Enzyme design. Structure first.
Site, PDB file in Angstrom:
ATOM      1  N   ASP A 183       3.070  -3.285   1.963  1.00 39.77           N
ATOM      2  CA  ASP A 183       2.451  -2.777   0.450  1.00 39.77           C
ATOM      3  C   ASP A 183       1.116  -2.721   0.684  1.00 39.77           C
ATOM      4  O   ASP A 183       0.167  -3.528   1.047  1.00 39.77           O
ATOM      5  CB  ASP A 183       2.628  -3.888  -0.488  1.00 39.77           C
ATOM      6  CG  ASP A 183       2.536  -3.496  -1.997  1.00 39.77           C
ATOM      7  OD1 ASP A 183       1.580  -2.446  -2.241  1.00 39.77           O
ATOM      8  OD2 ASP A 183       3.284  -3.998  -2.836  1.00 39.77           O
TER       9      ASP A 183
ATOM     10  N   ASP B 123       2.944   4.060  -1.334  1.00 39.11           N
ATOM     11  CA  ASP B 123       2.425   2.836  -0.437  1.00 39.11           C
ATOM     12  C   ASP B 123       3.297   1.671  -0.395  1.00 39.11           C
ATOM     13  O   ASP B 123       2.812   0.557   0.535  1.00 39.11           O
ATOM     14  CB  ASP B 123       1.465   2.326  -1.463  1.00 39.11           C
ATOM     15  CG  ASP B 123       1.847   1.306  -2.499  1.00 39.11           C
ATOM     16  OD1 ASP B 123       1.029   0.344  -2.947  1.00 39.11           O
ATOM     17  OD2 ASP B 123       2.895   1.580  -2.967  1.00 39.11           O
ATOM     18  N   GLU B 124       4.678   1.767  -0.387  1.00 35.44           N
ATOM     19  CA  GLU B 124       5.463   0.749  -0.023  1.00 35.44           C
ATOM     20  C   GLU B 124       6.603   1.173   0.789  1.00 35.44           C
ATOM     21  O   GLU B 124       6.751   2.458   0.867  1.00 35.44           O
ATOM     22  CB  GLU B 124       6.069   0.260  -1.542  1.00 35.44           C
ATOM     23  CG  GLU B 124       5.303  -0.382  -2.450  1.00 35.44           C
ATOM     24  CD  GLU B 124       6.120  -1.277  -3.186  1.00 35.44           C
ATOM     25  OE1 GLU B 124       5.744  -1.902  -4.287  1.00 35.44           O
ATOM     26  OE2 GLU B 124       7.397  -1.129  -3.227  1.00 35.44           O
TER      27      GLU B 124
HETATM   28  N1  LIG Z   1       2.034   1.734 -13.277  1.00 32.05           N
HETATM   29  C1  LIG Z   1       1.636   2.198 -12.081  1.00 32.05           C
HETATM   30  C2  LIG Z   1       1.590   1.537 -10.973  1.00 32.05           C
HETATM   31  C3  LIG Z   1       1.176   1.887  -9.766  1.00 32.05           C
HETATM   32  N2  LIG Z   1       0.674   3.308  -9.765  1.00 32.05           N
HETATM   33  C4  LIG Z   1       0.222   3.802  -8.480  1.00 32.05           C
HETATM   34  C5  LIG Z   1      -1.385   3.683  -8.151  1.00 32.05           C
HETATM   35  C6  LIG Z   1      -1.288   2.325  -7.249  1.00 32.05           C
HETATM   36  O1  LIG Z   1      -2.512   2.764  -6.221  1.00 32.05           O
HETATM   37  C7  LIG Z   1      -0.007   2.581  -6.322  1.00 32.05           C
HETATM   38  C8  LIG Z   1       0.504   1.455  -5.643  1.00 32.05           C
HETATM   39  O2  LIG Z   1       1.563   0.925  -6.687  1.00 32.05           O
HETATM   40  P1  LIG Z   1       1.096  -0.511  -6.800  1.00 32.05           P
HETATM   41  O3  LIG Z   1       1.223  -1.668  -5.428  1.00 32.05           O
HETATM   42  O4  LIG Z   1       1.872  -1.370  -7.913  1.00 32.05           O
HETATM   43  N3  LIG Z   1      -0.390  -0.761  -7.077  1.00 32.05           N
HETATM   44  P2  LIG Z   1      -1.700  -1.313  -6.162  1.00 32.05           P
HETATM   45  O5  LIG Z   1      -1.489  -0.713  -4.916  1.00 32.05           O
HETATM   46  O6  LIG Z   1      -3.075  -1.108  -6.517  1.00 32.05           O
HETATM   47  O7  LIG Z   1      -1.245  -2.831  -6.459  1.00 32.05           O
HETATM   48  P3  LIG Z   1      -1.520  -3.961  -5.338  1.00 32.05           P
HETATM   49  O8  LIG Z   1      -0.599  -3.662  -4.357  1.00 32.05           O
HETATM   50  O9  LIG Z   1      -3.056  -3.282  -4.871  1.00 32.05           O
HETATM   51  O10 LIG Z   1      -1.656  -5.111  -5.995  1.00 32.05           O
HETATM   52  O11 LIG Z   1       0.704   3.337  -7.207  1.00 32.05           O
HETATM   53  C9  LIG Z   1       0.899   4.307 -10.769  1.00 32.05           C
HETATM   54  O12 LIG Z   1       0.124   5.374 -10.824  1.00 32.05           O
HETATM   55  N4  LIG Z   1       1.158   3.597 -11.969  1.00 32.05           N
HETATM   56 MG   LIG Z   2       0.108  -1.785  -3.385  1.00 34.27          MG
HETATM   57 MG   LIG Z   3       3.127  -1.240  -4.506  1.00 38.05          MG
END
Ligand SMILES: Nc1ccn([C@H]2C[C@H](O)[C@@H](COP(=O)(O)NP(=O)(O)OP(=O)(O)O)O2)c(=O)n1
Ligand SMILES: [Mg+2]
Ligand SMILES: [Mg+2]
EC number: 2.7.7.7
Length: 342
Positions: A9, A104-105
């Site tokens: 992630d 990202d996953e």
């Molecule tokens: N509700 C959402 C959730 C995520 N995203 C997008 C933006 C994030 O950069 C990306 C990655 O998903 P995420 O892992 O849930 N988010 P993020 O990487 O910021 O969380 P962390 O992994 O950093 O805690 O998806 C979105 O556009 N709407």
């Molecule tokens: Mg993430």
């Molecule tokens: Mg994620």
DNA sequence: TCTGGGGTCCTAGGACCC
DNA sequence: GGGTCCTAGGACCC
């Protein structure tokens, strides 16, 4: 026969790439999303901004109310995509058994890998490294004998960390593991389960599968299994996109069909270019549309149809507009197609 | 403060088939 | 009545 699953992630993914590219954004609160006046929400935020309580999926209204110095960014998807591709190639260096869940996953099955002395831990660590190298971005990881457990694990030592759960730790882990942490249990389900006294997997292990099936159907079975720690879901790698749509919410609600039309006109080329990318003949199984009103109810009309056709979408969008708007305002217009079954 | 846009999967009634 | 397609909608995730 236990498996080795790694959930990788990227942390603050969109934010991260913005900061790599612009170092001035580093220690100040920033977020990706639509503007206040554009009725937008936050995609993600960097950690300075989370400090103030800024979460993803959250209205930008609330976001600035919480962090008035928030820097709002529109976001660059090719940048994120480029990163994605890179990290998937990096995965490919260690296994072929790779199931992306998004940009990202990814799930990795590393069980039959001989890379780092079959050490899933060293594999994940070597992957978080080399990702920080050659991308200058930061990733977190979770190791477990199954998908969901590795997923919950990947967010335990974030940012820039990883967490391993061996089969011996599992039962202990599940005992106090709240049901809402389980992917697929959002707010509503969590609220029903709470309302019947169920908060952790510990609490459901003491429950009856029959009743759980009566109450939640197949979702009950899922719950029960995941609670027992059971997740026979195989990592895939073969999965394919089933549909594509394009939608838009305007700054103010629209009340006239002329305006709705005006929207569709602008949405169609988008939908076309995107569908061409994966289907140049434009051959689809079903197309249709989507409105959502002021009372936020959302309707969709979709029917069998051989090939992306603009006028049909306009037509059915007019039908929709007539037969079920009952004078409400309209905040979003959306087109949609359902791809053929191969 | 007032709610994106891109998707997946699941449910459920009628149609249609046998 | 059991499959399966059709359509609409909801819950969920990133
Ligand atoms: N509700 C959402 C959730 C995520 N995203 C997008 C933006 C994030 O950069 C990306 C990655 O998903 P995420 O892992 O849930 N988010 P993020 O990487 O910021 O969380 P962390 O992994 O950093 O805690 O998806 C979105 O556009 N709407
Ligand atoms: Mg993430
Ligand atoms: Mg994620």
């Amino acid at each position: 026969g236990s498996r080795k699953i790694i959930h990788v992630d990227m942390d603050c993914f969109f934010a991260a790439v913005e900061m790599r590219d612009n170092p001035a954004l580093r220690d100040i609160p920033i977020a990706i999303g639509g503007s206040r006046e554009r009725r937008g929400v936050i995609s993600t935020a960097n950690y300075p901004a989370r400090k103030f309580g800024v979460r993803s999926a959250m209205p930008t209204g609330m976001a600035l109310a919480l962090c008035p110095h928030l820097t709002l960014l529109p976001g660059r998807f090719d940048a994120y995509k480029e990163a994605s591709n890179h990290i998937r190639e990096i995965f490919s260096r260690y296994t072929s058994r790779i199931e992306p869940l998004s940009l990202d996953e990814a799930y990795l099955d590393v069980t039959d890998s001989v890379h780092c002395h079959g050490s899933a831990t060293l594999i994940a660590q070597e992957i978080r490294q080399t990702i920080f190298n050659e991308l200058q971005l930061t990733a977190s990881a979770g190791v477990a004998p199954v998908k969901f457990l590795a997923k919950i694990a990947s967010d335990m030592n974030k940012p820039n960390g990883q967490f391993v759960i061996t089969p011996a730790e599992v039962p202990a882990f599940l005992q106090t593991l709240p049901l809402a942490k389980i992917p697929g249990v959002g707010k509503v389900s969590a609220a029903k389960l709470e309302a019947m006294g169920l908060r952790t997997c510990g609490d459901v292990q003491a429950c009856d599968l029959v009743m759980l099936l009566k109450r939640f159907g197949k979702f009950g079975r899922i719950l029960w299994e995941r609670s027992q720690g059971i997740d026979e879901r195989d990592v895939n790698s073969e999965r394919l996109r089933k549909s594509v749509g394009v939608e838009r919410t305007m700054a103010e609600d629209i009340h006239h069909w002329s305006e709705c039309e005006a929207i569709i006109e602008r949405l169609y080329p988008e939908l076309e270019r995107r569908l061409a990318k994966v289907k140049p003949d434009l051959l689809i199984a079903r197309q249709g549309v989507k409105l959502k009103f002021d009372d936020f109810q959302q309707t969709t009309q979709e029917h069998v149809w051989p090939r992306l056709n603009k006028a049909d979408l306009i037509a059915t969008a007019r039908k929709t507009w007539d037969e079920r708007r009952g004078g409400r305002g309209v905040r979003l217009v959306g087109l949609h197609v359902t791809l053929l079954d191969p």
